[PDB]
Amino acid sequence: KNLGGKSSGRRQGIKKMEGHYVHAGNIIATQRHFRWHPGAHVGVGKNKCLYALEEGIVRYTKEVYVPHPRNTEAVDLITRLPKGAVLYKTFVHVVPAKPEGTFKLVAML
Amino acid sequence: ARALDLLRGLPRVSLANLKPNPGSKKPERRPRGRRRGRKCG
Amino acid sequence: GRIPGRQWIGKHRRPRFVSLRAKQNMIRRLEIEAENHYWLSMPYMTREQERGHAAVRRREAFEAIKAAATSKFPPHRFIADQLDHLNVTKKWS
Amino acid sequence: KVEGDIWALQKDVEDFLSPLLGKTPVTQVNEVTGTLRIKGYFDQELKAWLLEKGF
Amino acid sequence: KFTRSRIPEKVFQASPEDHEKYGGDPQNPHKLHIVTRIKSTRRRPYWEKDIIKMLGLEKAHTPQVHKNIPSVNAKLKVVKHLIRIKPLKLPQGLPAEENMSNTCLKSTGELVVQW
Amino acid sequence: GGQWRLQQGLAANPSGYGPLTELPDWSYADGRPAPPMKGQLRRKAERETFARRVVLLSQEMDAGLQAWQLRQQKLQEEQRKQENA
Amino acid sequence: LRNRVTDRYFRIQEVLKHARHFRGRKNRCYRLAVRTVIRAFVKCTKARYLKKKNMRTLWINRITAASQEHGLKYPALIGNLVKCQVELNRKVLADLAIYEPKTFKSLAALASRRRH
Amino acid sequence: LTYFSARKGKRKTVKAVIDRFLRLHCGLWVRRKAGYKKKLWKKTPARKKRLREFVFCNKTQSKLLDKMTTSFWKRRNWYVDDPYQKYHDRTNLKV
Amino acid sequence: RQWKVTSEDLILIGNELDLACGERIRLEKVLLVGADNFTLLGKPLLGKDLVRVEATVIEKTESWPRIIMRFRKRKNFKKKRIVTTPQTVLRINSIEIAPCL
RNA sequence: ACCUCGGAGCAGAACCCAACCUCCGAGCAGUACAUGCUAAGACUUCACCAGUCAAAGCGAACCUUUGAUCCA
RNA sequence: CCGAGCCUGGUGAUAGCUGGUUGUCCAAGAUGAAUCUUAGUUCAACUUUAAAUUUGCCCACAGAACCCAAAUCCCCUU
RNA sequence: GAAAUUGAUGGCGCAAUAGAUAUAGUACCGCAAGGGAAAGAAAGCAUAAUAUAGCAAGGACUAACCCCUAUACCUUCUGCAUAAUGAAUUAACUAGAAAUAACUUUGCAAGGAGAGCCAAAGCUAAGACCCCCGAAACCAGACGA
Ligand SMILES: [Mg+2]
Ligand SMILES: [Mg+2]
Ligand SMILES: [Mg+2]
Ligand SMILES: [Mg+2]
Ligand SMILES: [Mg+2]
Ligand SMILES: [Mg+2]
Ligand SMILES: [Mg+2]
Ligand SMILES: [Mg+2]
Ligand SMILES: [Mg+2]
Ligand SMILES: [Mg+2]
Ligand SMILES: [Mg+2]
Ligand SMILES: [Mg+2]
Ligand SMILES: [Mg+2]
Ligand SMILES: [Mg+2]
Ligand SMILES: [Mg+2]
Ligand SMILES: [Mg+2]
């Protein structure tokens, strides 16, 4: 009487652990809901996958979570916290490796 | 050349002295014996 | 007096019993390994001291491996080997 | 199309190419066919070198 | 399931009683292990097999000298149930180039430069 | 009875190291020594490699400790040298 | 019949010569002989381990008899000779038991003395 | 396919391959993505863009296609204004 | 191996010795020497000064062909090899003892 | 009775994991009509097919599941 | 020897099914997806050979989630 | 699966189970259509039955047996002494055919090839690689009450 339930796994999770070198555009982690939040130089897709916006080293950190005020449910959740409480989340950052360019001598006019 | 001098020293080249260049003639594999027989690959 | 099924696998197996000899053998092994624990409890260098102390040798060894791998190439061919085959018809005159 | 001391040619080629590679090149001397086979592409360099030698 | 086993660190913390029993000084610890394989790697996990191959202990009862450093010790901890470890003792110091060909490893674990 | 031999410090197996295996089996009746036996030569080569590895490992570990000491000294001396003003 | 085997006689004989001392048709019929000859050769190969195993057992039995003639037990004899640093092996000890009874008596006395 | 035709004794080409795949001389096979003309009204713009693309084949797919076509289809063609003229050869390829 | 030996005895060593036939040799690892009324036991070897056992290389031969046969049922596994081992026959010429006790 | 897809447990912590296994759900709707075009780099349901994400750029503006080929 | 005769021919029918597959010797070599599909096949994985050049495994620290255990992943050294 | 167009006496055979079916389309079989041969110049026994015990042997041994060791082979299976298959035995016969692309070795080389074809080191030549037996059937035409 139990049908369905034959769906395969989504192969989600972290694709780049901490310290892994990541080029711009590489997907860092795919998640179904926000297990890891985007940090510095990390973007978010429609499906909440984290990709590197710059070329660098992936780092995972814990930071205080302050949601966008337009996120009404999160704002209410915060409104219900006690005074000392601060929410925390796991964030993924890309520490950019190369400089974004150098000045070169082109012509000795 | 020294090769022609070696020829001068060696026996006459005939149809009984001829050999293919090594590596040009792979051995033929046929399904007889333990290793190539039975189920014959 | 038979054990149902096949011995040593099923739910009902032949009762196996530990002999004094088996106990002594196991105890001997245990003593060896207790000594192993002791001798593994005193590292000579710390992890930070060992970091990089063999890097040069390891790099040279891998250079040797790479050289062997990249030096693979067909062997030389000599006129002498080809011409020596004429000797199959060497005779006495 | 090498004639003469193919081994002398091999020595010369190794001398000429080792600085470019940084290592002595790996080669095969087909003394029968009179050819020298070098691992890696050096057609342009070897052509220039043979021109300089006057072949 | 069967998995790799994490040995708690307290296992590898010698006590004064152990020091007296085995005759090793925690200060000035020995430099080199002599490791022999005394147990088969058959019926052992592939990771223990691989560790044995790395350490070069494929042949049983053939002593092998290894550094007494934390990484080698980590591997030895993985395969400690297949090996016998004894410190390498150097009564006359390490052999000199002159007598490098006249050494012998006594069963006590001493490398003597006379044989 | 190998345990007793081990206690006395000999090889557990009398066929291991010892006079019975390491000495020449024979010599010429004149007195000239016999050529070394193949097994003895192989065993000597193995022992030489073992000693060479012992020396190499000891030297590598000592050099590593000395290099770490020098690195610590350089770090402390440089951090002190930064105090210049 | 471009190519036909002409040596089959000799190929058969190579096997049959090894079966000529068998019983029944195994010594005549190649189909049967070849199977038994293979078994005979495999047994011959595997018997080199059993030969050594049985010789040592034979030596141990003979040494046990000889030592019991002098009130010793084989374990005591062997262990005490080792402790006295006599490295005579079991083959030689059995040979001495058979052909040099006074020397074996001396060794048994030595083993008992060491034991005491 | 037909390894030996009954009239010539030659190997034949599977024309279903020729109707679907482009072979670049270097050994690459190009193809359209399946469904690139089907029910576009229910496909997101990104999916449509992915589907409208010309795509290379696997090594094993390329080997299969090479087997299924004859050497005529694997020749140099110097067409006048071939859009794939530049793609017919590989550049800066290390191994 | 250990050989129980006496003068005029023959010994079959299962390997070539690198000695010309008829060449005289001294066997140096003598564990035991015995007479009718006394025996001398080494610990484990007697001194060179005590005993001198001498032999002669009488023959250098090959053993009869030994068959190595491997067979496993129902595996098409069958292998045959013939091996001949080198051998040397030594004759023990004399056993001399000296009063060096 | 079921056959495709998806969610949860088995399968606790990267991924992955069956069943006549224990439960649940879907064959689209709402929205707008840039919900356009292009394009680095990636993910990928263990193959392929297919399916995802996406910087930069151009252009307007200021979105949240089902099915191939041929054939018409 | 008739739920559709016999003979010849097509015909060496076809058989994902059963059986068989002949010298010597050495070496490497073992448990997913789709499918009128689960007695089969194709792709993968594994495997073999040859070739190119350069890191591979092991691997501590750091690191990998909220909701509501054994371990695993990742990699400096070694 | 085209066409236009192009134009071009011998035996690394068999030798009486082979080679023709063939000494013969005979003998023989069939009502008939039809099928269709054979052949000419070791095994098995006997000399000489048999001796406790055992995959019939091996290690051996002074000695055949006695002692000790040893669960036929093939195939099919996860796994077979298996009380799963096949085999009385001897002789003879009886089963891996080939392309695409590779690789190896030659030749020549920005060209190769004895027209056509290929070519961004290629082209030309050679070498290596793809089994045997078996249905119930289907259809055509004969032959049979
Ligand atoms: Mg599920
Ligand atoms: Mg095989
Ligand atoms: Mg039972
Ligand atoms: Mg994938
Ligand atoms: Mg009828
Ligand atoms: Mg058939
Ligand atoms: Mg093997
Ligand atoms: Mg279907
Ligand atoms: Mg089937
Ligand atoms: Mg025409
Ligand atoms: Mg005929
Ligand atoms: Mg007869
Ligand atoms: Mg049977
Ligand atoms: Mg059956
Ligand atoms: Mg039968
Ligand atoms: Mg009538």
Swiss-Prot record, chain B:
Composition bias type Basic residues, residue spans: 27-41
Shown part of the complete sequence: 10 to 50 of 296
Places the protein is found: Mitochondrion
Protein source organism: Homo sapiens
Family in the record: Belongs to the universal ribosomal protein uL15 family.
Domain of life (superkingdom): Eukaryota
Subunit structure: Component of the mitochondrial large ribosomal subunit (mt-LSU). Mature mammalian 55S mitochondrial ribosomes consist of a small (28S) and a large (39S) subunit. The 28S small subunit contains a 12S ribosomal RNA (12S mt-rRNA) and 30 different proteins. The 39S large subunit contains a 16S rRNA (16S mt-rRNA), a copy of mitochondrial valine transfer RNA (mt-tRNA(Val)), which plays an integral structural role, and 52 different proteins.
Span list, region Disordered: 13-41
Name by which UniProt lists this protein: Large ribosomal subunit protein uL15m
Swiss-Prot record, chain D:
Protein localization: Mitochondrion
Tissue note: Ubiquitous.
Assembly with partners or alone: Component of the mitochondrial large ribosomal subunit (mt-LSU). Mature mammalian 55S mitochondrial ribosomes consist of a small (28S) and a large (39S) subunit. The 28S small subunit contains a 12S ribosomal RNA (12S mt-rRNA) and 30 different proteins. The 39S large subunit contains a 16S rRNA (16S mt-rRNA), a copy of mitochondrial valine transfer RNA (mt-tRNA(Val)), which plays an integral structural role, and 52 different proteins. Interacts with OXA1L.
Family, similarity comment: Belongs to the mitochondrion-specific ribosomal protein mL49 family.
Protein name: Large ribosomal subunit protein mL49
Native organism: Homo sapiens (Human)
Range of the intact protein held here: 112 to 166 of 166
UniProtKB/Swiss-Prot annotation, chain H:
UniProt keywords, alphabetically: Mitochondrion, Ribonucleoprotein, Ribosomal protein, Transit peptide
UniProt subcellular location: Mitochondrion
GO terms (BP aspect): mitochondrial translation; translation
Keyword Ribonucleoprotein annotated: yes
Molecular function GO labels: structural constituent of ribosome
Description of how the protein assembles with itself and partners: Component of the mitochondrial large ribosomal subunit (mt-LSU). Mature mammalian 55S mitochondrial ribosomes consist of a small (28S) and a large (39S) subunit. The 28S small subunit contains a 12S ribosomal RNA (12S mt-rRNA) and 30 different proteins. The 39S large subunit contains a 16S rRNA (16S mt-rRNA), a copy of mitochondrial valine transfer RNA (mt-tRNA(Val)), which plays an integral structural role, and 52 different proteins.
Protein name per Swiss-Prot or TrEMBL: Large ribosomal subunit protein bL35m
Native source organism of the sequence: Homo sapiens (Human)
Gene name linked to the record: MRPL35
Shown chain mapped onto the complete sequence: 94 to 188 of 188
UniProtKB/Swiss-Prot annotation, chain I:
GO molecular function, one term: structural constituent of ribosome
Keywords annotated in UniProt: Mitochondrion, Ribonucleoprotein, Ribosomal protein, Transit peptide
A GO BP annotation: mitochondrial translation
Subcellular location: Mitochondrion
GO cellular component, one term: mitochondrial large ribosomal subunit
Record flagged with keyword Ribonucleoprotein: yes
Subunit structure: Component of the mitochondrial large ribosomal subunit (mt-LSU). Mature mammalian 55S mitochondrial ribosomes consist of a small (28S) and a large (39S) subunit. The 28S small subunit contains a 12S ribosomal RNA (12S mt-rRNA) and 30 different proteins. The 39S large subunit contains a 16S rRNA (16S mt-rRNA), a copy of mitochondrial valine transfer RNA (mt-tRNA(Val)), which plays an integral structural role, and 52 different proteins.
Sequence similarity: Belongs to the bacterial ribosomal protein bL21 family.
Name assigned to this protein: Large ribosomal subunit protein bL21m
Gene it is expressed from: MRPL21
Span within the parent record: 104 to 204 of 205
